[PDB]
Amino acid sequence: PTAREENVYMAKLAEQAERYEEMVEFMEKVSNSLGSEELTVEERNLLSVAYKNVIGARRASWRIISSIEQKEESRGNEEHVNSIREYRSKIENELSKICDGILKLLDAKLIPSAASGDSKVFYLKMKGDYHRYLAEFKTGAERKEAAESTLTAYKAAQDIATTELAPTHPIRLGLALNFSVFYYEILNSPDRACNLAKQAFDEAIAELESYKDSTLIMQLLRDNLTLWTSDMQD
Amino acid sequence: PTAREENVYMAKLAEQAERYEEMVEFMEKVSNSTVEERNLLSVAYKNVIGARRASWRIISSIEQKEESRGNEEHVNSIREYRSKIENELSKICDGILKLLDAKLIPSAASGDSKVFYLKMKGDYHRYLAEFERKEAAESTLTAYKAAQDIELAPTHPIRLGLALNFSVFYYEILNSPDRACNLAKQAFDEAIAELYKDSTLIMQLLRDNLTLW
Amino acid sequence: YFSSN
Ligand SMILES: C=CC(C)(C)OC[C@H]1O[C@H](O[C@@H]2C3=C([C@H](C)COC(C)=O)C[C@H](O)[C@]3(C)/C=C3/[C@@H](COC)CC[C@H]3[C@@H](C)[C@H]2O)[C@H](O)[C@@H](OC(C)=O)[C@@H]1O
Numbered sequence: 434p435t436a437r438e439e440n441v442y443m444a445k446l447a448e449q450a451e452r453y454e455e456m457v458e459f460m461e462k463v464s465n466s467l468g469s470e471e472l473t474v475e476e477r478n479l480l481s482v483a484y485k486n487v488i489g490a491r492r493a494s495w496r497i498i499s500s501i502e503q504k505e506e507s508r509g510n511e512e513h514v515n516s517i518r519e520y521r522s523k524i525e526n527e528l529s530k531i532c533d534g535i536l537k538l539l540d541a542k543l544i545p546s547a548a549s550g551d552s553k554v555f556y557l558k559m560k561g562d563y564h565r566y567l568a569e570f571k572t573g574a575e576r577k578e579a580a581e582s583t584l585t586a587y588k589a590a591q592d593i594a595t596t597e598l599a600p601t602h603p604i605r606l607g608l609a610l611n612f613s614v615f616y617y618e619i620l621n622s623p624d625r626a627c628n629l630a631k632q633a634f635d636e637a638i639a640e641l642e643s644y645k646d647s648t649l650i651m652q653l654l655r656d657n658l659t660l661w662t663s664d665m666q667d
Numbered sequence: 668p669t670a671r672e673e674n675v676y677m678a679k680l681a682e683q684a685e686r687y688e689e690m691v692e693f694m695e696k697v698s699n700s701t702v703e704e705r706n707l708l709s710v711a712y713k714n715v716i717g718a719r720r721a722s723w724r725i726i727s728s729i730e731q732k733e734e735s736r737g738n739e740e741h742v743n744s745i746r747e748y749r750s751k752i753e754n755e756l757s758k759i760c761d762g763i764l765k766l767l768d769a770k771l772i773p774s775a776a777s778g779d780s781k782v783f784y785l786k787m788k789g790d791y792h793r794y795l796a797e798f799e800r801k802e803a804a805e806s807t808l809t810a811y812k813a814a815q816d817i818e819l820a821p822t823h824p825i826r827l828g829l830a831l832n833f834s835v836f837y838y839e840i841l842n843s844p845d846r847a848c849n850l851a852k853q854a855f856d857e858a859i860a861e862l863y864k865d866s867t868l869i870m871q872l873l874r875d876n877l878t879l880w
Numbered sequence: 881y882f883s884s885n
Contacts, residue, residue, distance in 0.1 A: 434740050442741070446729060446748055450722035494684035496881070501683060512668045513676060520680050607885040614884050653883040661882075 437463060444479050453486040457534075464538060471546045481559060484535050488566055491531060495524050495570055525570050532563040539563075550597030551604055557590035558608045561615070568619050580619055587612050600636035606650040609633035613657065623661055630654050671697055678707050687714040691762075698766060705780070709787060712763050716794055719759060723752050723798070753798050760791045778818045779825055785814035786829040789836070796840050804840055811836060821858035827869040830854035834876065844880055851877050 440459045447456035460480035464472065472480070502517040543556045564583040571579050591612065594605040609630055616626035634654045637647065644651075674697040681690035690711035697704060730745035772784045789810035795803035811833045819826055830850060837847035855873045858866070 439744065443744060443748065446726065446745065449729065450725050450752075451718070452722055452752075490685065494686050497684045498680060501680065516673060516677060517680060520677070524684075611884055614882050617882060650885060653885065657883050 437466070441476055441479065444483065448479070448482065451486075453483055453490075456483040457487055459483075461534075461538070464542060467542065467546070469546050471543070471548060471552055477552070477555060481555075484531070484563075488528070488531050488563070491524065491528055492566060492569070495521065495528065498524060499570075521570075528566065528570060532567050535563050536560060550593055551602070554590045554594045554598060554604045554608055557586050557593070558604070558611060560586040561590065562611060565611070565615050565619060580615075583615060583619070587615060599642075600633070600640045601642065601644060601647050603647050603650065606633060606637060606647055606654065610650055610654050610657070613654075617661065627658060627661060630658055634658070671700060675704060675707065678711065682707075682710065687711055687718070691715055695762075695766070698770060705783065708766075709783075712759070712791075716756070716759050716763075716791070719752060719755050720794065720797070723749065723756070726752060756794060756798065760794050763791045764788065779823070781817045782814050782819075782825045782829055785810050785817070786825070786832060789814065789829075790832055793832075793836050793840060796836075804836075807836055807840065820861055821854055822862055822866045824865050824869065827854065827858060827866055827873065831869055831873050831876070834873075838876075838880065848877055848880055 440463050444456050444459040444463075447453065447459065457480070460476070460483050463476055464480065471477075498517060498521045502514060502521060505513045505517060539556055539560050544553075544560070547553045547556050561583045564579055564586060567579040568576055568583060587608070590608050594602075594608055598605040600606075609632075613626040613630035616622045616629065634651065637651055674693045678690045678693045681687065681693060691708070694704065694708040694711055698708065726745060726749045730742055730749060733742045733745060767784050767788055772781075772788070775781045775784050789807050792803055792807040792810055796807050811829070814829050815833065821827065821830075831854075834847045834851035834854075837843045837850070841847075851873055855870065855877070858870060
């Protein structure tokens with residue numbers, strides 16, 4: 434029962450009990466004890482799932498605050514808007530730290546120490562995810578340089594995915610799904626989004642490792658495509 | 668737009684954005700100076716304590732599972748993690764019990780306000796009774812008793828919410844389905860004889876407890 | 881808020 438086996442196990446207790454912030458701290462201590470050695474497949478997923486649930490709740494709250502704000506601004510009730518603007522500012526500064534916490538961990542050790550192609554596309558995609566989450570709320574010059582880092586990290590992940598990983602590889606299908614989503618809402622290009630996610634979907638159908646894991650993304654890819662292609666408006 | 672009005676508006680943003688810990692703090696200042704505000708402080712604290720207790724149920728299940736298999740070292744880690752979770756339950760219950768004791772319960776003027784505050788006292792004491800327990804259940808029965816004594820129709824929600832919360836305290840904490848059902852059956856039929864969307868929500872939950880008990 | 885992973 435080493436200290437590394439202690440924190441990997443204690444992360445599953447915070448994961449099972451929805452104590453995700455502490456689950457991040459446990460996996461953070463797992464990473465900040467390694468030189469040029471990378472995390473195992475489970476430890477890799479653990480940390481990423483831990484940060485996923487954390488940033489997911491913060492994002493949900495931000496979308497809700499932005500929506501209520503844009504209604505009060507649509508009404509013109511200014512004394513309420515100034516309060517929602519201040520409240521959203523607090524949420525956005527947390528998101529800065531949450532993305533800073535993983536990006537400065539991806540940039541420091543996870544990406545350089547990635548040896549296999551599976552870990553390269555993994556940690557590269559992760560960078561794009563949290564840089565894309567910054568582009569959701571950041572405005573002005575920060576948004577431009579955020580989507581720059583989102584597009585740059587997603588592209589390098591695609592080079593490694595298209596030459597080393599198989600089309601049905603989860604790490605590759607998930608990369609392409611996030612890639613298409615980045616095109617649709619952040620760059621507002623449906624054809625750049627659809628052509629990337631149609632290309633990646635059909636190469637998984639043509640080629641077809643248990644695919645229950647992959648087909649979960651294949652159902653989320655086709656769902657995205659189909660609803661986009663529909664002429665109706667969100 | 669007074670300062671008290673801003674807290675009611677600010678708690679709505681915390682209530683809507685599923686950020687419940689701050690809603691208690693925004694409503695905490697308002698108390699240190701209405702019907703909706705009474706619900707605002709109740710709902711914010713209710714979800715805060717609900718999140719912590721649910722984690723403890725799975726932790727106790729995860730720690731009892733390892734004791735069944737026999738993992739003294741794994742069980743030690745779970746019990747230590749459980750102690751930190753229980754330590755949070757004391758601070759969350761300490762704030763609500765101190766808020767009601769110092770100002771809320773004493774300043775309760777109407778009879779409908781006295782039942783609602785003493786019910787929260789018995790509720791937050793029942794949270795202390797799940798994990799000292801003899802005093803917690805004592806303060807739980809003492810709070811639930813005077814809230815039953817203090818003058819309204821059974822259909823009124825504060826009475827039905829108290830009768831359901833009190834009927835559950837006897838079943839799980841005191842292990843007495845006889846005296847518990849007699850409280851839920853007496854409170855349910857008295858609401859049907861006198862008879863509501865807010866009241867029937869508890870009336871459907873009163874039956875769900877009795878029909879499976 | 882389209883699907884993502
Ligand atoms: C380790 C903890 C848990 C959450 C139980 O692991 C769940 C799953 O964790 C992995 O699944 C990942 C993965 C998911 C799979 C698509 C499906 O997993 C399950 C359990 O159904 C869902 C998650 O979003 C997760 C963890 C994340 C990603 C994400 C990673 O970015 C770097 C993009 C794609 C997807 C990858 C990592 C999936 O491979 C594994 O590949 C799965 O096992 C196999 C054979 O694929 C395992 O079931």
